[PDB]
Structure formats: structure tokens, C-alpha cells
Design a protein around this ligand. Structure first.
Ligand SMILES: [Ca+2]
Ligand SMILES: [Ca+2]
Ligand SMILES: [Ca+2]
Length: 341
DNA sequence: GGGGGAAGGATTCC
DNA sequence: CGGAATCCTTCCCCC
């Protein structure tokens, strides 16, 4: 198996650089403004000229504006990035049919039946990089290895605008001397949680006992890291479909008033059904972010599709169930639909 | 004992 | 002091 991984570099910010070439060379920060005070929100994407000064995705906008006060701060236009991303994805499927779109800015290509060795794959990645650059002016990073995890690791090491092949020998080497926190799927919570057991490298998960690792980081991520340490990970490249569509809005003013929250919730439903397009959902969940930024959610699955009018009635019932079983105020309210037909 | 699925909190990531 | 989506553990019914 030879998997090729393509990751669009700082995608959100690069599309803004492409749509306005006056921005390249300058620090660019793509933000999400909730709309409470003037600069309330978070950073979604920052280019590398902004990441060098500590501006990274996740931090508040005012924390970014304290570091780079005159950097270019633009609002996030997800609909634009999704259309550009879909165009690039269509270029990728001309190189292989077995494609796994993992996110808006990355996809896995199974080029086992198109390429003999890692040299042919490296030359294929160079042509994929040039094509994306020629047709969309977007630079990507290419990772090639024996499975999806190490193909993504290759791109993680050579980003941005890079290419890297991890052969069978470097895999066994990376198993011993790669930080466990830089394994795909290992976020911050599991990483710090893994440091509390001395687990710093991938090889160390074998020298521990399974039930100890299972009770701490969960059985799922336990078997995941074990299979990688045994060099037995070989998950296939499968077509990924979108399973959930929802929209959450930050309400102006916190509230526990049903009539005050309903307009936001009904607005969230309308925008959710518009993005649903022809998809008919059978499950609906009402989710609320409390004043202390905690999340509470109530759901309900139907034996049939949910019409928009049914979603209106059921969402009020679920939101009432939230207010009945939690006494905190609500800061953000929203809905999510799943279990399509 | 566990299949099968629903509920919803917990993580990951742009 | 965002927001989208998936992950994944528990719980439940019942054969
Ligand atoms: Ca990216
Ligand atoms: Ca990515
Ligand atoms: Ca990580």
C-alpha cells in the first residue's frame, strides 16, 4: 500500500491571499467574530508570517491583536473556502479514484495501483503540486508513506510547500523517536494526558499494559496507538461522507428566557436546512453553550425524516428540556442534524 | 454475554 | 472568551 496525502497550506489565509494578492508577504489572520464586543471571537487560521510571532488558531482575536495589531484581520468566509476546496478535490480525483477527503484542506490518495515504488509516487506528488499551483495558485504539502497516519506525518514535517516520503525504515525509526503528541488524532487533551504516564514516544505504548492505557486515554485511542507501534496500522482509504450539519449562534445577551432564545434557535434551524439542501435528517440535537462556556445538548431520533416544521416544534421541546435540567444561563444556542437518508 | 442503536458528553481541528 | 464536525463512552432494550 502506497498512500499519498495532500494538505493545503494555511488554507483559509491562502485563499484570501489568492483573492487579494496584495496580502502575500504580510501577516494574515482569518478570524471568527461572535459579535458581542468589538473584537470578540477567536482565530481560525493564520499564515506562516503570523504564526512566527505566536498567532495561532484558537487564541482570542484581542490576544492576536496585542501581538500583531496592524496585521490583516479578515472575517472567515467558509463558503468561499469550501468552493475552492471542492475545485482542488476534483483535481485530486483525476489522479486516483480511491480518495478520502479528510477535511476541508486535506485528502488521502491510495495510489497503490498507479505507482510501483516511492520514486514514482514522489514524481506523482510533484505533478499534483504543480497542477494545483497552476490551476488555483494554491501551494500544498505532499506526504507519502505506507499508511494514512505516516503519510500525514510526512506532510506535517515538510509543511509548507513541501514533499516528503517516509520509507519502511523511517517508519520503524519514527516509532521510536517521534513525539506521541504529533501523532494524527492526538489532540492537546490526550497529549498532556499521555505525558502523565511517561508515554512520550510511540514505542512506549508497547512497554505499558493495555488496561492502564485503556482507562486513561480510552479504548479507541489505545488500540489506535498500539497498532501504530506494532507497525500494523493499515486502514483503507474510504469515501467519507458528511454525517452532521448544524449551526450555533452566539446570542446577544445571555438569557434563560424561552421567547428570547427562540429567534436565534429558529434562525439556526433555517440556515441548517439550507445547508442540508436535499438531505433529509432523522435525528435533531439542540445544543447550548452556557455562560461558563460549558456545553449541554438534548437530542431525539425519529423513525422518519424531519420536516422543517417538525424541527421547529421539536427544537423548542428539547430547548425546554435543557432549561429544565440545567440552571445556568445560555450564551450560545444552536441545532445539529444527523442520520440522513 | 453481547447485538444494535440511541443519547450526549468529550476531543479534535479549521 | 468561535464554530464546525467527529469521536467515543455510556446507557438501554432485549434476545
Ligand atoms: Ca491547512
Ligand atoms: Ca489540514
Ligand atoms: Ca497533536
Amino acid at each position: 500500500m502506497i498512500v499519498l496525502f495532500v494538505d493545503f497550506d494555511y488554507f483559509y489565509a491562502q485563499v484570501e491571499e489568492v483573492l487579494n494578492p496584495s496580502l502575500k508577504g504580510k501577516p494574515v489572520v482569518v478570524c471568527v467574530f461572535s459579535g458581542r464586543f468589538e473584537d470578540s471571537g477567536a482565530v481560525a487560521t493564520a499564515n506562516y508570517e503570523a504564526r512566527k510571532f505566536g498567532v495561532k488558531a484558537g487564541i482570542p482575536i484581542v490576544e492576536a491583536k496585542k501581538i500583531l495589531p496592524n496585521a490583516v484581520y479578515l472575517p472567515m468566509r467558509k463558503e468561499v473556502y469550501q468552493q475552492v476546496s471542492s475545485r482542488i478535490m476534483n483535481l485530486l480525483r483525476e489522479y486516483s479514484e480511491k480518495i478520502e477527503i479528510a477535511s476541508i484542506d486535506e485528502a488521502y490518495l491510495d495510489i497503490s495501483d498507479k505507482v510501483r515504488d516511492y520514486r514514482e509516487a514522489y514524481n506523482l506528488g510533484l505533478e499534483i503540486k504543480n497542477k494545483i499551483l497552476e490551476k488555483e495558485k494554491i501551494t500544498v504539502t505532499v506526504g507519502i508513506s505506507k499508511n494514512k497516519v505516516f503519510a500525514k506525518i510526512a506532510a506535517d514535517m515538510a509543511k509548507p510547500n513541501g514533499i516528503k516520503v517516509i520509507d519502511d525504515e523511517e517508519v520503524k525509526r519514527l516509532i521510536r523517536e517521534l513525539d506521541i503528541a504529533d501523532v494524527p488524532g492526538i489532540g492537546n487533551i490526550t497529549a498532556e494526558k499521555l505525558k502523565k504516564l511517561g508515554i512520550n514516544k510511540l514505542v512506549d505504548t508497547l512497554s505499558i499494559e493495555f488496561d492502564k492505557l485503556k482507562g486513561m486515554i480510552g479504548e479507541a485511542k489505545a488500540k489506535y496507538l498500539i497498532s501504530l507501534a506494532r507497525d500494523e496500522y493499515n486502514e483503507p482509504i474510504r469515501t467519507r461522507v458528511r454525517k452532521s450539519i448544524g449551526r450555533i449562534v452566539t446570542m446577544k445577551r445571555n438569557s434563560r428566557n424561552l421567547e428570547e432564545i427562540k429567534p436565534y434557535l429558529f434562525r439556526a434551524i433555517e440556515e441548517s436546512y439550507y445547508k442540508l439542501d436535499k438531505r433529509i435528517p432523522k435525528a435533531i440535537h439542540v445544543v447550548a453553550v452556557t455562560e461558563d462556556l460549558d456545553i449541554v445538548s438534548r437530542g431525539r431520533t425519529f423513525p422518519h425524516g424531519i420536516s422543517k416544521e417538525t424541527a421547529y416544534s421539536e427544537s423548542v421541546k428539547l430547548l425546554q428540556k435543557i432549561l429544565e435540567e440545567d440552571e445556568r444561563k445560555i450564551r450560545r444556542i444552536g441545532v445539529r442534524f444527523s442520520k440522513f437518508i
